[PDB]
Ligand binder design. Structure first.
Ligand SMILES: Cc1c2[nH]c(c1CCC(=O)O)Cc1[nH]c(c(CCC(=O)O)c1C)Cc1[nH]c(c(CCC(=O)O)c1C)Cc1[nH]c(c(CCC(=O)O)c1C)C2
Ligand SMILES: Cc1c2[nH]c(c1CCC(=O)O)Cc1[nH]c(c(CCC(=O)O)c1C)Cc1[nH]c(c(CCC(=O)O)c1C)Cc1[nH]c(c(CCC(=O)O)c1C)C2
Lengths: 356, 356
């Protein structure tokens, strides 16, 4: 692959001092871009995911607009449940659905052996290799997957939920089957994530988007062990294959309660939602790990001037070291690309002022 | 197995009233789908048939496109002659061939004992069980086989024929050897069909695709007895194994002349080609059996609007009761998937209008 030119994001991830704070945005390839909608209009979502050229194009679009310090491959977290043998649809304005969710223990029998999942996800690897070549070293490319608990929620609920009542009913009433499912997911995720690195990914983010529905007791029992196992095993396999392990990011949305434990889970970077005050997060995680985040995505509805001031304040609270700027969650479809631009420029401008 | 969610097809097959008319299409897994061609490009046809995952994928593809009321397992009718010990090929754009057809009585000696055939077809059972699990109760799964006479034609002719002159020359010149062959086929088919149900099939269709080459006299002598024996024996074996018998469909293409006899042959459903007027078929078969069919497959070359009107007329002629919609024969490779979609949507739309 082409040599990396701007490695600021990786240096920050590993905890090195940098000349400025690197920034990227969750869902930077997203509907808020008119060009994203145009490219997507051609296929259904999961078909787009299976076209390496379409994924590469969608990955590159935000970088043509903004000097983001990382690209993230266009894909979905739900490709893993799909590769395990569940049927998923992207519903006309209602989002992802599994019309046949897992509801009893016997339903686990219809899943693939997790050791075959990576082969089913070759298309993601193809997209990654293509995008890495086309980026030509501009910035690092981030690969990603959903975390075991969050993937379980989709598989059991059959889509989004305000309570996760069915998935939590599994944890309390079916603890053994729940552990079985979470282990299947873990065993699928590890080879998938390794394959993403083999294909060219230079960092990995694990999205535990549904962390917040669990308290600490359930999180520690059912989410945390598998978060830890993913990191441990991915790093092991990469080292054994003669490759360099990449920085890994754990993002537990609404996971305020788990920050101390997440800081000791084998990830270089802990990503934060906007509800956690940066200084409190720093106290929780300590001084080695890098923090990522955490601007309220809705802050981008504010004026460009206001966005710059909110960014200044955020950067003051995080301080210059061990920090990668991002939003607290992904961009929303009605946001103005110029305000995303304002966010990026502000992190760059203020982080430099903050150093000298 | 997962509990069946949409059982409309089975209710219709047994002759129960339903809220709408269920529909499926012969060759719904077929070349008209670009994704079918892609999946097939990897192997030769009979090798694809021997991969449970490939068969499951091909079975599911049409359901991802259209709300069909049944799935049919991807396989071939020629797996039975192959399992009996004949060598078959799928010729580069010339279709199935047996380079060493049966031509004299002594040639029967090279066939397996029909009681071992089911064991040779384990791969079909594996595909069925996998597909049943993966479908997760969305719709019922149909298993199938060729009828004895039609299988004989392939075995003697060595492929397709416009006249079946060699196979008919067997019936007239070699009646005893012909009965011997038809009995071998019957004795192979029964355990195969039972095994398909044991593996998860929820209905069975027997394809007498080559019925039309026979008149009534030859059909009644050489085809009908074995059609009857298949149904009787399959139901007996299932009951004796403690399983529930499934609805069975007999489809005699070009079999206008045999409809009265087919209605008394022990099948819940008589399938019709497009040449038989629905009202005349209803008169022939009487009021218990369910009819299946019968739109000219070539009608799908017409505009989506025209397809809807032809469907409306067809449904008017059949009436709402004791009817499963399908084409009169399988989809052709040059047909437009959107027109197949139009067919499905039209049956659903008009059948509901026809009830209330
Ligand atoms: C990383 C990523 C994701 N989605 C997409 C990407 C592409 C990478 C690029 O982001 O910029 C494209 C991606 N994926 C999807 C879309 C929108 C569909 C469309 O384009 O019409 C896009 C752009 C579909 C999708 N897929 C998902 C949802 C949310 C459902 C819910 O609210 O519960 C949705 C809406 C599941 C999903 N997908 C993702 C998450 C994690 C979000 C986070 O925690 O920050 C989740 C939970 C992550
Ligand atoms: C049920 C079924 C069949 N074929 C195939 C299936 C898979 C199930 C899914 O249909 O949708 C795949 C199936 N089987 C075959 C194909 C095409 C080969 C390819 O994919 O290149 C497919 C998709 C090969 C095949 N196999 C056969 C033919 C026809 C030969 C002739 O015209 O005499 C052909 C072309 C024999 C056959 N096969 C079948 C019949 C009955 C057709 C009917 O009466 O409606 C017959 C007569 C039935």
């Amino acid at each position: 692959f082409p040599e990396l030119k701007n490695d600021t994001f990786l240096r920050a991830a590993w905890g090195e001092e940098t000349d400025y704070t690197p920034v990227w945005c969750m869902r930077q390839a997203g509907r808020y871009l008119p060009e994203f909608r145009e490219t997507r209009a051609a296929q259904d979502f999961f078909s787009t995911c299976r076209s390496p050229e379409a994924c590469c194009e969608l990955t590159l679009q935000p970088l043509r607009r903004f000097p983001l310090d990382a690209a993230i491959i266009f894909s979905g977290i739900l490709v893993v449940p799909q590769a395990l043998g569940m049927e998923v649809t992207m519903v006309p304005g209602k989002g992802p659905s599994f019309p046949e969710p897992l509801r009893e223990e016997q339903d686990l029998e219809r899943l693939r052996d997790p050791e075959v999942v990576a082969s089913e996800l070759g298309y993601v690897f193809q997209a990654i290799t293509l995008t890495r070549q086309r980026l030509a070293g501009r910035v690092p490319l981030i690969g990603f997957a959903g975390a075991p608990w969050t993937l379980m929620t989709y598989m059991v609920e059959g889509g989004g939920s305000s309570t996760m009542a069915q998935a939590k009913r599994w944890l309390y009433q079916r603890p053994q089957a729940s552990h079985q499912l979470l282990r299947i997911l873990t065993d699928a995720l590890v080879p998938y994530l390794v394959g993403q690195v083999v294909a060219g990914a230079q960092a990995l983010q694990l999205f535990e988007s549904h962390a917040g529905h669990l308290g600490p007791q359930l999180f520690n029992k059912f989410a945390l062990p598998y978060i830890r196992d993913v990191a441990k095993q991915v790093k092991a396999r990469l080292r054994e294959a003669g490759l360099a392990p990449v920085p890994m990011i754990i993002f537990a949305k609404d996971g305020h309660f788990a920050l101390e434990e997440l800081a000791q889970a084998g990830y270089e970077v802990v990503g934060l939602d906007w509800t956690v005050a940066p200084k409190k997060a720093r106290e929780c995680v300590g001084k080695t790990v890098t923090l990522q985040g955490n601007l309220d995505p809705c802050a981008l509805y504010a004026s460009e001037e206001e966005i710059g001031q909110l960014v200044k304040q955020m950067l003051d609270d995080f301080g210059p070291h061990r920090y990668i700027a991002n939003l607290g969650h992904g961009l929303y479809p009605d946001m103005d690309p110029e305000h995303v631009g304002a966010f990026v420029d502000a992190v760059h401008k203020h982080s430099r002022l903050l150093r000298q």
